[PDB]
Write a protein that binds this ligand. Structure first.
Ligand SMILES: O=C(N[C@@]12C[C@@H]1CN(c1nc(Nc3cnn(CCO)c3)ncc1F)C2)C1CC1
Length: 287
């Protein structure tokens, strides 16, 4: 409901960009004194078509109703006159994504497992509101402080239809996708759990680019495959091939990743089942 007046918005820097959206940091200072607030503002590119434009209004709606400690805070909206839509105004998460943070700060196993647990809490909450994330990766997990992580983007999030268990593109994050998404084109709550396992893998590799899911999966498929990357990915996953065990990852946590990566979606734990398990594995490594 909150409206941001564009007259007090001074752009500081870019925070991220996708194929149709962009996030920039702004100072919102209705003075010029030291009462100024730091905000993250998401805008839809003015060139985006009607499908992306209607999906944008849906994204804004989803964030307006989502309230959880491990989910980015919605701040307000403002008229984006140049793009002839709205701009999504959110809180500025000071330490950025884990994708950018982890390659530069050696973090202990216990802190990573705590982050893992916080992602699950945020995701179980999202699933209880009947939404699927569709884009759970370390790039969408924002660090507030060394003990607080938040799901910071909902660009692909969809409401699961009332009498259905699932929701039915070159921008799709295929290297974080369960075989049922790639093959049957169906996204279940269990499909987000697969993606979590990929995000947990990223955390345990400290988001090293040479260990990343696209790097690792493209080394297994090869690069001279024509339009067959997705087809070849679907078949290595069906032969039980998986992302390796990250160096310094305990066997137990790796088994847990493998359980999120069950080919049979029904054999995957829910995010509710993951919470007490992660609490327990974290308490262990914290001491
Ligand atoms: O950029 C996008 N989505 C989000 C998840 C990305 C980063 N974003 C946000 N980032 C931050 N803080 C911060 C600090 N540093 N850095 C850059 C290093 O990571 C980002 N706060 C709020 C946000 F909303 C939103 C969509 C493709 C356009």
């Amino acid at each position: 409901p909150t409206v941001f007046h564009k007259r007090y918005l001074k752009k500081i820097r870019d925070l991220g960009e996708g194929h149709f959206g962009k996030v920039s940091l702004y100072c919102y200072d209705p003075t010029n004194d030291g009462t100024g607030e730091m905000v993250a503002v998401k805008a839809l590119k003015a060139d985006a078509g009607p499908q992306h434009r209607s999906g944008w209004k849906q994204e804004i709606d989803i964030l307006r109703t989502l309230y959880h400690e491990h989910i980015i805070k919605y701040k307000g909206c403002c008229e984006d006159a140049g793009a002839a839509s709205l701009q999504l105004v959110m809180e500025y998460v000071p330490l950025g994504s884990l994708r950018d943070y982890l390659p530069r700060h050696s973090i202990g196993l216990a802190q990573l497992l705590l982050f893992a647990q916080q992602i699950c809490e945020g995701m179980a909450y999202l699933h209880s509101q009947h939404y699927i994330h569709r884009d759970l990766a370390a790039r969408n997990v924002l660090l507030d402080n060394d003990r607080l992580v938040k799901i910071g983007d909902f660009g692909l999030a969809k409401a699961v239809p009332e009498g259905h268990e699932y929701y039915r593109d070159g921008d799709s994050p295929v290297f974080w996708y369960a075989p049922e998404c790639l093959k049957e084109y169906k996204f279940y709550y269990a499909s987000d759990v697969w993606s979590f396992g990929v995000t947990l893998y990223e955390l345990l590799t400290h988001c090293d680019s040479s260990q990343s899911p696209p790097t690792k999966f493209l080394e297994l498929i090869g690069i001279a495959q024509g339009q067959m990357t997705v087809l070849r990915l679907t078949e290595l996953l069906e032969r039980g091939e998986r992302l390796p065990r990250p160096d310094k990852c305990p066997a137990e946590v790796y088994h847990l990743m493998k359980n999120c990566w069950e080919t049979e979606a029904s054999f995957r734990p829910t995010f509710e089942n993951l919470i007490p398990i992660l609490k327990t594995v974290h308490e262990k490594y914290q001491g």
